[PDB]
GROMACS .gro file of C-alpha atoms in nm:
model
   99
    1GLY     CA    1   1.149  -2.481   0.054
    2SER     CA    2   0.799  -2.485   0.197
    3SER     CA    3   0.625  -2.733   0.425
    4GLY     CA    4   0.251  -2.773   0.471
    5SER     CA    5  -0.027  -2.654   0.244
    6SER     CA    6  -0.250  -2.371   0.361
    7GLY     CA    7  -0.047  -2.055   0.406
    8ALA     CA    8   0.098  -1.942   0.737
    9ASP     CA    9   0.372  -1.729   0.586
   10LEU     CA   10   0.077  -1.522   0.469
   11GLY     CA   11  -0.052  -1.398   0.803
   12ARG     CA   12   0.315  -1.388   0.895
   13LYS     CA   13   0.374  -1.128   0.626
   14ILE     CA   14   0.096  -0.914   0.768
   15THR     CA   15   0.152  -1.006   1.130
   16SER     CA   16   0.487  -0.830   1.131
   17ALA     CA   17   0.309  -0.536   0.973
   18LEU     CA   18   0.039  -0.507   1.236
   19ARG     CA   19   0.311  -0.590   1.487
   20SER     CA   20   0.490  -0.282   1.361
   21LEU     CA   21   0.211  -0.085   1.523
   22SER     CA   22   0.209  -0.239   1.869
   23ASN     CA   23   0.568  -0.117   1.874
   24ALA     CA   24   0.500   0.218   1.711
   25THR     CA   25   0.416   0.494   1.955
   26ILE     CA   26   0.314   0.771   1.719
   27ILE     CA   27   0.042   0.588   1.529
   28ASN     CA   28  -0.099   0.810   1.256
   29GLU     CA   29  -0.238   0.805   0.904
   30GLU     CA   30   0.116   0.765   0.777
   31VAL     CA   31   0.171   0.455   0.988
   32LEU     CA   32  -0.135   0.274   0.859
   33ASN     CA   33  -0.056   0.404   0.512
   34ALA     CA   34   0.298   0.275   0.549
   35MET     CA   35   0.214  -0.045   0.734
   36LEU     CA   36  -0.049  -0.095   0.466
   37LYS     CA   37   0.217  -0.113   0.197
   38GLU     CA   38   0.342  -0.398   0.412
   39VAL     CA   39   0.000  -0.558   0.440
   40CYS     CA   40  -0.149  -0.486   0.100
   41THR     CA   41   0.161  -0.668  -0.017
   42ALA     CA   42   0.076  -0.995   0.154
   43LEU     CA   43  -0.261  -0.979  -0.017
   44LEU     CA   44  -0.086  -0.900  -0.343
   45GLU     CA   45   0.146  -1.191  -0.272
   46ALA     CA   46  -0.164  -1.402  -0.226
   47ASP     CA   47  -0.352  -1.356  -0.551
   48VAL     CA   48  -0.607  -1.089  -0.467
   49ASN     CA   49  -0.652  -0.846  -0.753
   50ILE     CA   50  -0.474  -0.514  -0.717
   51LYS     CA   51  -0.809  -0.351  -0.786
   52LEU     CA   52  -0.930  -0.530  -0.475
   53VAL     CA   53  -0.625  -0.471  -0.260
   54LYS     CA   54  -0.676  -0.111  -0.366
   55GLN     CA   55  -1.029  -0.126  -0.227
   56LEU     CA   56  -0.916  -0.303   0.088
   57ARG     CA   57  -0.679  -0.033   0.208
   58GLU     CA   58  -0.963   0.217   0.197
   59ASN     CA   59  -1.222  -0.020   0.339
   60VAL     CA   60  -0.962  -0.071   0.610
   61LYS     CA   61  -0.834   0.282   0.662
   62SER     CA   62  -1.198   0.385   0.654
   63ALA     CA   63  -1.268   0.117   0.912
   64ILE     CA   64  -1.048   0.322   1.141
   65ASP     CA   65  -1.022   0.695   1.198
   66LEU     CA   66  -0.686   0.866   1.159
   67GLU     CA   67  -0.849   1.193   1.057
   68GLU     CA   68  -0.910   1.242   1.427
   69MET     CA   69  -0.775   1.009   1.694
   70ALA     CA   70  -0.652   1.146   2.025
   71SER     CA   71  -0.459   0.851   2.164
   72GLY     CA   72  -0.519   0.512   2.321
   73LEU     CA   73  -0.372   0.163   2.313
   74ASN     CA   74  -0.716   0.078   2.178
   75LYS     CA   75  -0.628   0.242   1.848
   76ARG     CA   76  -0.341  -0.001   1.811
   77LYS     CA   77  -0.582  -0.272   1.920
   78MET     CA   78  -0.884  -0.191   1.706
   79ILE     CA   79  -0.629  -0.139   1.431
   80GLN     CA   80  -0.440  -0.463   1.480
   81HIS     CA   81  -0.777  -0.635   1.485
   82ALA     CA   82  -0.940  -0.416   1.223
   83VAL     CA   83  -0.698  -0.542   0.960
   84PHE     CA   84  -0.688  -0.899   1.085
   85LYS     CA   85  -1.065  -0.866   1.075
   86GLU     CA   86  -1.094  -0.723   0.725
   87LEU     CA   87  -0.887  -1.019   0.610
   88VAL     CA   88  -1.189  -1.222   0.714
   89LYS     CA   89  -1.411  -1.007   0.496
   90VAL     CA   90  -1.219  -0.944   0.176
   91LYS     CA   91  -1.552  -0.951  -0.003
   92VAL     CA   92  -1.764  -1.218   0.162
   93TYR     CA   93  -1.839  -1.523  -0.049
   94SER     CA   94  -2.195  -1.589   0.061
   95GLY     CA   95  -2.210  -1.606   0.439
   96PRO     CA   96  -2.378  -1.393   0.706
   97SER     CA   97  -2.357  -1.074   0.503
   98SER     CA   98  -2.608  -0.793   0.457
   99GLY     CA   99  -2.571  -0.590   0.139
   0.00000   0.00000   0.00000
């Protein structure tokens, strides 16, 4: 079963992931790493090439900073958005990009 044609379930697969953070209190490299396995999946369940999804995690993890992050709800924010943001990137097609 599946109604509509666009996705939905997609962001829903990741949503829960990112949502796993808002709940999480620790928040560390592991988390992202773990949560990633939950996100990277969605992408993998989309069509994106593993080689890409393998470059996303980094581009994402690198977009953050677990190597050194005191503490702040922001982290969970900038993180929850970071990902949701990267999803927008995923290798621009030909928009407002500067290589």
